[PDB]
Design a binder for this molecule. Structure first.
Ligand SMILES: NC(=O)C1=CN([C@@H]2O[C@H](COP(=O)(O)OP(=O)(O)OC[C@H]3O[C@@H](n4cnc5c(N)ncnc54)[C@H](OP(=O)(O)O)[C@@H]3O)[C@@H](O)[C@H]2O)C=CC1
Ligand SMILES: CCCCCCCCCCC[C@H](O)CC(=O)SCCNC(=O)CCNC(=O)[C@H](O)C(C)(C)COP(=O)(O)O
Ligand SMILES: [Zn+2]
Lengths: 146, 209, 129, 96, 87, 342, 115, 145
């Protein structure tokens, strides 16, 4: 029940700031020219991009290449993951390695500081499914939740 | 009657048609691939595409067949098959008041010998199969578009062809002419997905593969 | 087989010039070979036994007069059916259409047992009927 | 009831009225915006709620074959009146 | 300045052609990261991938280097010139 | 842009373009052609008219159903213009008349009516107004047509500062009263050029070029306030132009020098007619003015449209005038009239 | 399997021969269309269009395909000869009323959401 | 405020938490003048001069393969390895745990609904948070029809 979210408060036409700083509708050409000029003038580490949460993968690589060509390696993300040590270098450091389907095989699960019921409802459903038949034992390290 | 709604079934006609199917199969084993009689007493002979001229001629000239009227000649396009085009001949014998079906197969770029020599009625029919589907019939007196407009690009009855086509017509005053433009419908054809997800007929249940 | 000086035409079959499809609608489109998923509203699988080929959805605007779903994509409501994946991809390559075939998902065979509803040691024992 | 939008366009029962800054209103000048004054939303409101003396009641819309398919409404909740889903007529138990 | 912006090692999991690369990433990697604890050395692996090395330089420049059938010492050597060839 | 003016579709008939426009005087020459282009891209046209609705029938089949809307309007009635331009992005002014009717002089249809159109369009809130004048527009030209056009241009510029002003030189087309005029001059004996027509230089522009220029100027975001001049690619000597016109028509050519005052008398005699005045004093004058070259003014090529030479699109105009004898001769049979270099 | 029936020609060279003679017929014809059909395009302006139509499907290499378009072009020539096509039918080859379409990515992005 | 395209209005690659990279297909076109995100970035790069190489969706997918070959193996879990190396690199910082308890940001149904932009802009999730927050009196309606 979130498809209605894609019917309200949408951005349809490009907006630019006018002489009062008020957002006004403009053609794609004007806004793209403004952004292109600002990218051309300011270069180096003064250029940055904070990728969102619902973005795709194609746009991420496009933005990464665009900001790399202006020598900007300040591509950040809203979420914070510990970059100390291996960080993103090793994939298994930031992956649910044994897959969602593997939950139905494990015998002991230790969830640390998580509420999978809301953070990942299908993952919690899989944990419950394994809990029913396989008699898997759960242990929580975070705050008590339902 | 015990079956006031079920259509009556005739078995004598079934036996006669099966006997004639075996007769035709024995007469021309070179081309007759498979013969079958439907439940509603219609006999179909599936032949190799090379047997178009011979088999028809036999069915037209044999004393025991005497099929001297090409009722209908058509094609059915099944994209999932290798040779998608499936040419169908419907013949009627006025002496034995019986209808027969001779069905052959052919892909997009394989020619079929024109049956105009045997059935002179086929001359127009063949053109239609050429125009609607694209099956080229060699040794034809004149192959041309028969239904589509002049300069049409494509074969409309092919499954891989939109029912609205690609080009619509209009009158342009700038050129004072009936010009052709890319198709653009005011209301798109609403494609209805009406198909029950529950198996209808247990008899025609394809075995799993 | 066919004794008419039967010629080797090894190079792959292509009727892109024999279909009448315009320039635009033959490479910028992307067909999709897939087995349709069962409608989760229902519980019948008779619609998940034939492969289907379809074309990417394009612009669908509103008619200014009445508000219809006007479109300019002829290959929008055209969906082909195929008995097997290989035949569907053969059709896609034959007509020169870019594809991306998805494998056929199959429901994994479960293990049902009425007795488990009334188990004595396990947690599958139901609390209601 | 049909009422007038600030531009001057009458709103239909579906709440449809072209915006002031909408060019489509050009179609209505020298013509009229065809609307139906008899609003079904209002017309069904003043129909009296029948005091049915049974737990459930069958409604066919009146006229048998002339009406809608016959449906049975359960009049058990005292806080609401059972309303037929086809014609909108209400029913109520006699004070339970 | 081409200050060795990023390294991307794309090795296959199972094929023997990437075997040497595996040995490298098995042993000669922890000390590599200890040497320069700023380099985004990427070890994004995939099935059926010829072992390759991408060296993204500054201003968006890349030079792919094949690592097919290389040894652990071979991969080590073919990488040391890359991170030592920049000032 | 409004929620319904966002461009949609692929430029076909049933595509939302966002060029909701009013074309005053659409029932005639370019007024038709412009609408066609406006109809082709899918723009809602609010074509006003004063003539019989039957004469607007050819206006009907160039727009998708619901796009083209016809309204009654009167030149001397501000309320009518306000009704027609109330909901429109652009207002194109194509009102004109080669003669002076009893109830409408040149000033009325080139100053008064454009003044009302521009003032009402500015009051309503339209964003573009494309006004059309003549290239040879001068406040001191003997013909009242060009003088009235000049004062009308000044007034329109004053009322609508950002109004695009387009000054076509001479439109030739299937119904042009410029090539058909010379072709029809065969009935009255020979063709009576003033001073043999060896001093007038004319630069004719194709009708399709002008209409496409109007459309591009509407689409161009920089045409506001500018004053374009739409001219053909070549400059023809008037005698050579008539030579080409009669060669493509294959009618006999009988040039005849004629004193200016006698031709003025002929123009008055033709003006007497209570119907379509075949020739007027203004008409015989204008065919004798040269096309004033204005290099400073921006041209069609700036809008992105290449002028089509008269030779390629002369067979369309004059194929009707040919008798049965040369009715099928090709376009390359007659060699292009020599042109004085620009 | 790899070897299948031929349509008319038994090699690419014979298919090119048929293409050559079809182009012969079209090139000889063109001015007759210009005059008879009362066309307004120049003679060369039709001959180059014949050339462009031939060059469009110049990438095909399956012989049977080449014979197929040889027959189709022969049919179009047949229609053009005995005034079976009309002025509008012939003029469709020169897409006149169609607005020019853009080729660069930037204009397509500016104009709509299409490939 | 260059308007982008949504997940229902684009064919794009998303990777779940297990590493599997799936792709969403276009169902509706972007509203108004909005366009695809990658197309917007590529057009901006062209305008600014530093034009990106990829000009089609397949080209962008090829570039994605160039950066990471496991972003194109659709519906294929590419198992990662080398946990020992990551652990060895991890045992160098010696960062000290704090005393604040590990409290998840969402601990009730009320926090589940309105999380992202689409959910926040939606109205049914507003009715849901209303239903869960105050009580049962906010969900009365004529459901007889
Ligand atoms: N070579 C040329 O002809 C050139 C012309 N122009 C200008 O282009 C414009 C259009 O030219 P063209 O289309 O050839 O002209 P036409 O005479 O063919 O058409 C003129 C249009 O103006 C309308 N009109 C004229 N007077 C009035 C009036 N008093 N009230 C209402 N409507 C009126 C006419 O209505 P109706 O049809 O009912 O009479 C018609 O729609 C004119 O301004 C003209 O001066 C500019 C450069 C060159
Ligand atoms: C417009 C008004 C008039 C009405 C309309 C006039 C145009 C009607 C055209 C009808 C014919 C049709 O379009 C084309 C056909 O059938 S076949 C084209 C040639 N295609 C091939 O044969 C395939 C391989 N191609 C080649 O081998 C080379 O292209 C070439 C042939 C040049 C040899 O080159 P080499 O030798 O270098
Ligand atoms: Zn009822």
């Amino acid at each position: 029940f979130a498809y209605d979210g894609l019917k309200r408060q949408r951005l349809t036409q490009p907006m630019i700031r006018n002489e009062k700083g008020l957002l006004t509708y403009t053609t794609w050409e004007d806004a793209l020219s403004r952004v292109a000029g600002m990218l051309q003038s300011f270069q180096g580490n003064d250029v940055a991009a904070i990728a969102g949460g619902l973005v795709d993968a194609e746009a991420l690589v496009a933005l990464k290449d665009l900001l790399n060509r202006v020598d900007s390696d300040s591509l950040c993300t809203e979420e914070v993951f510990p970059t100390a040590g291996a960080g993103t270098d090793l994939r298994s450091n930031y992956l649910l390695n044994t897959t969602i389907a593997g939950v139905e095989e494990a015998d002991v699960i230790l969830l640390v500081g998580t509420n999978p019921r809301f953070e990942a409802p299908l993952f919690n459903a899989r944990i419950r499914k394994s809990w029913l038949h396989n008699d898997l034992k759960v242990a929580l390290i975070g705050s008590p939740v339902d | 009657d015990t079956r006031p709604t079920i259509r009556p079934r005739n078995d004598v006609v079934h036996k006669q048609l099966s006997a004639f199917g075996q007769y035709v199969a024995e007469i021309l084993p070179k081309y007759v691939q498979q013969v079958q009689v439907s439940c509603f007493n219609e006999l179909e002979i599936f032949i190799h595409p090379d047997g178009v001229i011979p088999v028809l001629t036999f069915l037209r000239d044999h004393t025991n067949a005497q099929f001297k009227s090409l009722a209908d000649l058509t094609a059915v396009d099944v994209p999932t098959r290798q040779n998608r085009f499936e040419i169908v001949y419907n013949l009627l014998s006025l002496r034995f008041n019986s209808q027969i079906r001779v069905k052959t197969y052919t892909d997009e770029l394989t020619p079929i010998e024109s049956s105009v020599t045997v059935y002179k009625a086929a001359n127009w029919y063949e053109r239609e199969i050429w125009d609607m589907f694209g099956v080229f019939f060699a040794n034809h007196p004149d192959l041309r578009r028969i239904l589509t407009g002049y300069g049409f690009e494509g074969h409309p009855f092919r499954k891989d062809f939109p029912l609205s086509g690609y080009v619509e017509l209009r009158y342009d005053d700038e050129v004072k002419r009936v010009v052709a433009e890319p198709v653009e419908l005011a209301q798109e054809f609403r494609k209805f997905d009406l198909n029950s997800p529950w198996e209808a007929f247990p008899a025609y249940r394809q075995p799993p593969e | 087989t066919q004794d008419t000086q039967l010629i080797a035409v090894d190079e792959k079959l292509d009727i892109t010039t024999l279909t009448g499809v315009p320039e635009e609608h033959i490479k910028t489109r992307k067909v999709r070979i897939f087995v349709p998923a069962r409608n989760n509203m229902q519980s019948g699988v008779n619609n998940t036994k034939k492969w289907k080929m379809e074309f990417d959805t394009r612009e669908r605007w509103e008619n200014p007069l009445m508000g219809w779903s006007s479109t300019a994509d002829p290959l929008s409501n055209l969906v082909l059916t195929f008995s097997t994946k290989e035949d569907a991809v053969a059709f896609a390559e034959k007509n020169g259409w870019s594809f991306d075939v998805e494998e056929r998902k199959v429901p994994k065979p479960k293990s049902k047992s009425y007795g488990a509803n009334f188990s004595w040691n396990k947690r599958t024992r139901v609390s209601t009927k | 009831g049909v009422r007038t939008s600030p531009t001057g366009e009458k709103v239909t029962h579906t709440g449809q009225a072209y915006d002031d800054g909408d060019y489509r209103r050009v179609r209505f000048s020298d013509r009229q915006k065809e609307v139906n004054e008899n609003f079904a939303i209002d017309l069904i409101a003043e129909q009296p709620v029948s005091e049915v003396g049974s737990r459930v009641i069958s409604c066919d819309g009146g006229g048998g074959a002339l009406g809608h398919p016959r449906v049975y409404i359960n009049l058990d909740k005292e806080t609401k009146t059972g309303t037929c889903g086809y014609c909108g007529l209400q029913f109520r138990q006699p004070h339970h | 300045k081409l200050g060795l912006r990023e390294i991307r090692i794309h090795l296959c999991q199972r094929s023997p052609g990437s075997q040497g690369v595996r040995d490298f990433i098995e042993k000669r990697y922890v000390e590599l990261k200890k040497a320069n604890p700023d380099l985004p050395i990427l070890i994004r692996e995939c099935s059926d991938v010829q072992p390759k090395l991408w060296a993204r330089y500054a201003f968006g420049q890349e030079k792919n280097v094949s690592l097919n059938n290389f040894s652990a010492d071979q991969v080590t050597r073919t990488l040391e010139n890359v991170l030592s060839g920049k000032a | 842009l409004h929620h319904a003016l966002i461009p949609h579709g692929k430029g076909g008939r049933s595509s939302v373009s966002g060029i909701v426009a009013t074309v005053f005087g659409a029932t005639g020459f370019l007024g038709r052609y412009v609408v066609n282009h406006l109809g082709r891209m899918g723009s809602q046209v609010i074509v006003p008219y004063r003539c019989e609705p039957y004469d607007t029938m050819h206006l009907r089949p160039m727009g998708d159903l619901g796009q083209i809307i016809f309204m009654e309007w009167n030149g001397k009635d501000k309320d009518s213009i306000r009704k027609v331009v109330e909901h429109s992005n652009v207002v194109i002014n194509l009102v004109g008349r080669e003669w002076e009717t009893k109830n409408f002089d040149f000033e009325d249809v080139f100053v008064k009516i454009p003044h009302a159109i521009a003032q009402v369009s500015k009051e309503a809130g339209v964003e573009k107004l494309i006004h059309i004048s003549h290239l040879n527009a001068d406040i001191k030209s003997p013909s009242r047509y060009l003088r009235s056009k000049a004062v009308g241009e000044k007034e329109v510029r004053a009322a609508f500062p950002e109004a695009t002003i387009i000054k076509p030189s001479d439109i030739f087309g299937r119904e042009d009263r410029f090539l058909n005029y010379f072709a029809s001059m065969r009935w009255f004996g020979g063709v009576p050029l003033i001073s043999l027509g060896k001093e007038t230089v004319k630069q004719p522009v194709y009708i399709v070029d002008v209409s496409k220029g109007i459309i591009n100027a509407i689409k161009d975001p920089d045409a506001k306030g500018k004053t374009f001049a739409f001219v053909g690619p070549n400059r023809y000597l008037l005698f050579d132009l008539v030579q080409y016109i009669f060669a493509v028509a294959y009618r006999p050519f009988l040039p005849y020098p004629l004193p200016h005052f006698a031709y003025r008398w002929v123009g008055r005699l033709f003006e007497v007619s209570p119907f379509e005045p075949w020739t007027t004093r203004d008409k015989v004058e204008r065919v004798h003015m040269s096309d004033m070259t204005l290099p400073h003014l921006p041209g069609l090529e700036d809008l992105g449209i290449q002028a089509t030479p008269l030779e390629l699109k002369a067979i369309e105009v004059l194929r009707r005038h040919r008798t049965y004898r040369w009715l099928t001769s090709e376009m390359e049979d007659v060699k292009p009239a020599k042109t004085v270099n620009i | 399997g790899t070897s299948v029936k031929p349509i008319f020609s038994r090699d690419m060279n014979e298919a090119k021969r048929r293409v050559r003679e079809l182009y012969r017929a079209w090139y000889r014809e063109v001015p007759n269309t210009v005059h008879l059909f009362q066309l307004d395009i120049s003679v060369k302006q039709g001959r180059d269009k014949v050339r462009e139509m031939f060059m469009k499907n110049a990438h095909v290499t399956d012989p049977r395909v080449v014979d197929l378009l040889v027959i189709k072009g022969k049919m179009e020539l047949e229609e053009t000869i005995n005034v079976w096509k009309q002025r509008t039918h012939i003029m469709r080859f020169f897409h006149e009323t169609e607005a020019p379409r853009p080729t660069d990515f930037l204009s397509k992005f500016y104009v709509g959401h299409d490939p | 405020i260059l308007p982008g395209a949504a997940y229902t209005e684009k064919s794009a690659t998303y990777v779940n938490t297990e590493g599997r990279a799936q792709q969403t297909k276009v169902a509706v076109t972007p509203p108004g003048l909005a366009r695809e995100d990658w197309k917007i970035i590529r057009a901006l790069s062209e305008i600014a001069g530093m034009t990106l190489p990829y000009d089609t969706l397949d080209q962008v997918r090829s570039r994605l393969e160039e950066v990471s070959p496991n972003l194109v193996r659709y519906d294929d879990v590419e198992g990662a390895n080398y946990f020992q190396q990551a652990n060895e690199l991890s045992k160098l910082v010696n960062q000290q745990l704090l005393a604040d308890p590990l409290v998840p940001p969402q601990l009730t149904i009320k926090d589940f609904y309105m999380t992202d932009s689409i959910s926040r802009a939606s109205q049914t999730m507003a009715k849901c948070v209303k239903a869960v927050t105050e009580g049962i009196q906010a969900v009365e309606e004529p459901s007889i029809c």
